[PDB]
Structures are given as structure tokens and as C-alpha cells.
Design a protein around this ligand. Sequence first.
Ligand SMILES: CCS(=O)(=O)Nc1ccc(Oc2ccc(F)cc2F)c(-c2cn(C)c(=O)c3[nH]ccc23)c1
Ligand SMILES: CCS(=O)(=O)Nc1ccc(Oc2ccc(F)cc2F)c(-c2cn(C)c(=O)c3[nH]ccc23)c1
Lengths: 107, 108
Amino acid sequence: TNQLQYLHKVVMKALWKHQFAWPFRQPVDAVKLGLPDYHKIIKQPMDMGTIKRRLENNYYWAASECMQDFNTMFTNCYIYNKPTDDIVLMAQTLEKIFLQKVASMPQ
Amino acid sequence: TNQLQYLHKVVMKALWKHQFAWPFRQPVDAVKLGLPDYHKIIKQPMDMGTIKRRLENNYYWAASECMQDFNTMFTNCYIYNKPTDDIVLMAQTLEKIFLQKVASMPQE
Ligand SMILES: CCS(=O)(=O)Nc1ccc(Oc2ccc(F)cc2F)c(-c2cn(C)c(=O)c3[nH]ccc23)c1
Ligand SMILES: CCS(=O)(=O)Nc1ccc(Oc2ccc(F)cc2F)c(-c2cn(C)c(=O)c3[nH]ccc23)c1
């Protein structure tokens, strides 16, 4: 539907290109980053890559579904990371833009 | 606006009465909770009590403004607390509702 298309073509597109998007565009690599607790704390990993793919394979049945995955991705980052780490700020920024654009979503 | 009238009447009506709302209805009280570092970590405390009041006094110029306060209240909670605290789960459960509701907000 129109909403999933807006989330694809408008919202995801804007976040994807953002100067802070690079760490979010594929799943967290726990080994490559030296985060061996990661999968013990974050039991539902999400990333914009997985979300984009799902938006391409028509995985979602409603907008809120897709919205939830955005939220888990952010929530996850805020839960695992220290408050002082830049990655947290990076998510706050992206998260704010997601909300901004969701207000302008159709229906 | 249409959008803000949706947040007050649909969104906040549903969140304010939820069995998990209670820790969120008024500002985090660092003294009462024995959290001396709370204000050192969270710089923009937010709560539904504040948001409801703002909805009631038409403080917000646009819908998205309100949404960011709801966001900050949640983000605050996730950043301050331990991953395993119940308070997180409670925030998580309100936030799902918030987001589900926000998907059905009009557009003007
Ligand atoms: C495709 C992602 S990747 O995994 O393949 N690469 C990758 C690269 C850098 C990353 O973060 C950094 C950011 C800014 C710096 F200055 C240094 C960093 F290391 C993260 C990262 C992501 N996320 C969600 C976190 O929560 C998190 N916590 C700790 C690291 C991370 C992931
Ligand atoms: C109404 C504001 S209040 O401050 O006056 N009362 C109050 C009472 C209980 C609370 O949490 C609990 C919930 C359920 C339990 F079983 C035990 C708890 F402690 C919190 C609370 C809120 N928030 C946002 C937090 O981030 C947080 N972190 C640590 C506590 C909290 C605030």
C-alpha cells in the first residue's frame, strides 16, 4: 500500500543517505567490532538494511509493523550502548528525522 | 490542528490510562528513586504529565513537536536504565502503542 511505499521511497530514502547512516545500513557485526556481549543483550537485532529488504519483498502487512522495526533498531542501540558513545547521538538524530517524516505519512 | 487533536484525543487518551503508564505520568524523581546521576545522564527529562498539559494548553505549534516529546520520554528511559530493568519493558510496551497509533494520524 501507499504507506509502505512512502516509508520506502520517502522516509527510508532520507535516512539512508544521512551522514550518520553508515553504521545502521547492515546488521551489527559483534565479532568485527569486538562486542562479544552484543547478542546476549540485544535479543532482536534490527538494521535499516533488513528493513529495506523487507520493504522490497513486501514483508510488511501494515505501516506500524515497519515502524516497529525502525523503533527496535533505535531502541536496541540505546539499550546496549553507553549514554556517552557517539553511536547513541547518531541514533537520536536519525530517530528524530524518522518521526518528523512519519507525521507526513498518508491516510 | 487535526494532527494534534488526534494526539490528544486518541494517542494520549490510550497511553495515559494504560496499566504501565504510572511511572511515566509525572517527572522522574531522582531523589525518591535514589538515582543521583539521573540529571547527569538525561539532560531533557520528559513525561506524559508534561505532554498532556502541553496538549491541554495548546503549547505545541505542530503535531511533530508533540511526537518528539513522546520520543524523548521513551529514549530517555532506554538510555538511562539497565537493559534488564522492568521499566524498559514498560516503556517498550507504551511505545508500540504510540507508534501504532501514530501510523493512523491524518495529514495536515
Ligand atoms: C554495518 C554496521 S557494522 O557493524 O558492520 N559496522 C559498524 C561500524 C561502526 C559502528 O559504530 C561506530 C560509530 C562511530 C564511531 F566513531 C565508531 C564506531 F565503532 C557500528 C555500531 C552500530 N551500532 C548500531 C551500535 O549500536 C554500535 N555500538 C558500537 C558500535 C556500533 C557498526
Ligand atoms: C511517576 C514518576 S516518579 O519518579 O515519581 N515514580 C516512579 C516510580 C517507579 C518507577 O519505576 C519503577 C517501575 C516499576 C517498579 F516495580 C519499580 C520501579 F522503580 C519510576 C521510573 C520511571 N522512569 C521513566 C525511569 O526511567 C525509571 N528508572 C528507574 C525508575 C524509573 C518512577
